[model samples]
Target: MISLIAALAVDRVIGMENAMPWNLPADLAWFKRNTLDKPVIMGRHTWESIGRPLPGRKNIILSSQPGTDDRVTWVKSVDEAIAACGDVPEIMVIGGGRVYEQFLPKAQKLYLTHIDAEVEGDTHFPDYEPDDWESVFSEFHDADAQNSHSYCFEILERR
Candidate 1:
């Protein structure tokens, strides 16, 4: 049970120079709401990008580099990471482009926050077939002092 989750700009840009281009507190809260108790699997770069283990979830990182602690579990491959997630009802596939690409094809659902504005990014979300999914949920928000851009939260289930 894997669900790929990400926040991307209108151009499908997801990361900028190994980091996020902007911070939307509301969106971050929404992400926490959805992934809190689930297992989260990400590439090593993504883990490094975040700089710390996300609280309240089992954090599994795919990396050859050695670094493992009580807060993190380092795995050698994507398959190993997924296995580490065990029988959780759903595992959150967080990303830094490469991780998303590996699990996108296998994810049963997609939780995406689509930012309204376009922005340049060093990393981008991989292309997928819209016809292959059905939107199960959609909500829009307006930009405010706290948020840099207007955005929409959409949940797409594989058809």
Candidate 2:
């Protein structure tokens, strides 16, 4: 299965100045739980924002520029990124805007965290047709001491 994971605001903004605009521990924990032990593919900027290979997962970065770090595999195209995953049962696409855009069509599952607020950001998640997906699971979380915004975690499968 090809899964795309992202946390975006109501306006579909995912990042600002190379980083996430909000700090939500619950969302972060959710991300780790789903991505662990999977081969994750991400764009170069996302890898840079993270700054290191995510532990317990294969980090495959899609970039034209070759990276010196031996900790991750650098691929120039989406096909290469998918190939790097080999025969893994599930491939996780974690993102920057462009990466998500490229993978959105091929993705069979979506792990989305929809934030309640809209914030300014240069990067945005790609527009997807709601009719193309069916929600399999959803949970709303209120803002708490550790998380600043109310959000809903939703798992959608392509229809």
Candidate 3:
């Protein structure tokens, strides 16, 4: 299963200028918990935004741009990444707008946090057909001093 992981505000915004708009430790922890030990496939821009190879997992970057990082495994296309995954039961598609859009149709599951507030953002999560996905889990969270907004962690499985 290839899963897409993201946190989007109420306006459907995922990011602004390659950076997250809010600081939510719990959400970050949620991401780490889900992605650890899974091969993570990300777009070139997403890689740059993150700034380093995530530790503990194989980092597969999809890039047509000129660059080389000895720390990461690079692939020119999604097919190549899929092929590279081999026998791994699951791979995580960590994103920045376009990457998420490209994989949404093929994604088997979605780990997302629905933030309560909306903000100005340049990138947004892609639109999806409601009928194609079913929510398997959802848990609400309150905003505390560390978390800027109230949110719900939701898991959607493709139907």
Candidate 4:
């Protein structure tokens, strides 16, 4: 299964330049737990953001120009990365905006965290079109109610 993962905004803005604004611990934990021991596909910039290879996971960075630590395996393109990961049962396509766009058409599921706020960001999520995907699940967390920022665990399947 190919899964596209991201945290976006109403305007598709994902990051301020290359950095993510909010550190959604719950969502991060969710990603870790779910993708652990599985293959994860990301771009060069996304790998750089991580700074090092994460233990207990296979890191495949897709980029025209990409470099990573010993634990990282670099692929020139998204398709190459996906093809290489076919041996794995579940592949998590995790990334910044461009990476998400590259693999969106191939992904069977979308695991997204929508923050309740916005930031001045250069990176943005791809457009969420209802005509394209159906929302199978959404768990909303309110900032006022939870005493923090709001977010939602939303899953979408291709229509």
Candidate 5:
């Protein structure tokens, strides 16, 4: 299965200045739970923002520049990123804006964390028709000391 995962504000903002605009530990935990042990494909900018390979997952980066670290695999295109996943049962497209936009159409499922707030950001998630997806799972969390905004985790499968 090819899945795209992201946490976006109500306005679809995902990042500002190459970093997350908000802090939500709950969403981070949710991300870790879902992506651990999977092959995660991301754009070079996203990889740079993360600074290091995420533990327990195969980090595949789409980059024009060659990489020296064995912990990460560098590919030049979306097709190359997919090919690097080998026989993994699921390929997780974790992104910066452009990567998400490129993979949205090809993604079979979406793991979306909807933060209930509007945020100003340079990066945004691509728009998609809600009718084309069927929600298979959903859970809402209230804002607390650890989380600044109420959020909902939704798993939508392409119809």
Candidate 6:
């Protein structure tokens, strides 16, 4: 079973009002392709971000109440998500801030996009002490004058 995380950031801030303000087409494409034909686990707002069920995959949403559609299966706990879908080829955890903090402790691998710039926002990624995971792969991308945000695709494996 494989679980993956996809994130982008600048100045350590992740979101404002529970959503990403910028659009990175490449990142979105990567996410859809990577989690294709598999189950995706994520918190409430994360599920709503996409507006509807995505084709080619099962959507598992984490919530304290009932969700919006039949295509979405709501789980009250992280353990439930892991227990029920952990055996799938790829169980991807998409997110909002709380969702990331909730599962970061049990993560076996991380697929993060770290931005070189910073944003002024209320939400941020969970801070990890460097000793916790070993970064096995990293590919950097420079931001142009217009975008002004350099970033890297960072993959980390839990020790």
> Quick one: ranking by lDDT, best first?
2, 5, 3, 1, 4, 6
Backbone clashes in candidate 1 total 0
Which residue pairs show collisions in model 2?
Answer: none
Residues 111-145 of candidate 3 have per-residue lDDT tens digits of 99999886889889998776889999999999999
lDDT of 6 by residue, 1-159 (tens): 445576657656777764455556556666777778888787887687778887887877888886668877888898887776756755777776798787777778888877665557787777877678899988887776544466677778888
lDDT of 3: 0.89
Ranked by TM-score from best down, the candidates are: 2, 5, 3, 1, 4, 6
C-alpha lDDT of all candidate models, in order = 0.88, 0.92, 0.89, 0.78, 0.91, 0.73
lDDT tens digits by residue: candidate 2, 1-159: 899999999789998874555679999899999999999999988898899899999999998997768899999898989998999999999998999999998999999999988788988999998889999999999998989899999999999
Q: Which one is best on lDDT?
A: 2
Of 1 and 2, which scores higher on lDDT? 2
Which parts of model 6 are misplaced by more than 4 Å?
18-21, 144-148
- Please report the candidate that would top TM-score against the real structure: 2
Using lDDT as the yardstick, the better of models 2 and 3 is 2
Stretches > 4 Å off in candidate 1:
18-21, 68-70
TM-score winner, 2 or 6: 2
- Ranking 1 against 2 by TM-score, winner: 2
Model 1: per-residue Cα lDDT over 1-159, one tens digit each: 789999989679988864455668889988999999888998988887788998888899898878755579999988888889999899999896998998998999999999887677878898989999999999999989999888899999999
**Candidate 4, residue 139: CA error in Å?**
0.4
Cα deviation of 51, candidate 3, in Å: 0.9
TM-score of 5: 0.95
TM-score of each: 0.94, 0.96, 0.94, 0.88, 0.95, 0.85
Off by over 4 Å in 2: 18-21
| Model 4 C-alpha lDDT per residue in residues 1-159, reported as the tens digit of each score | 798878776577777764555556777786788688888888888788778877788888887864646568889977789887868787998887888887887788898877877678788777757778889999997765323478888888888
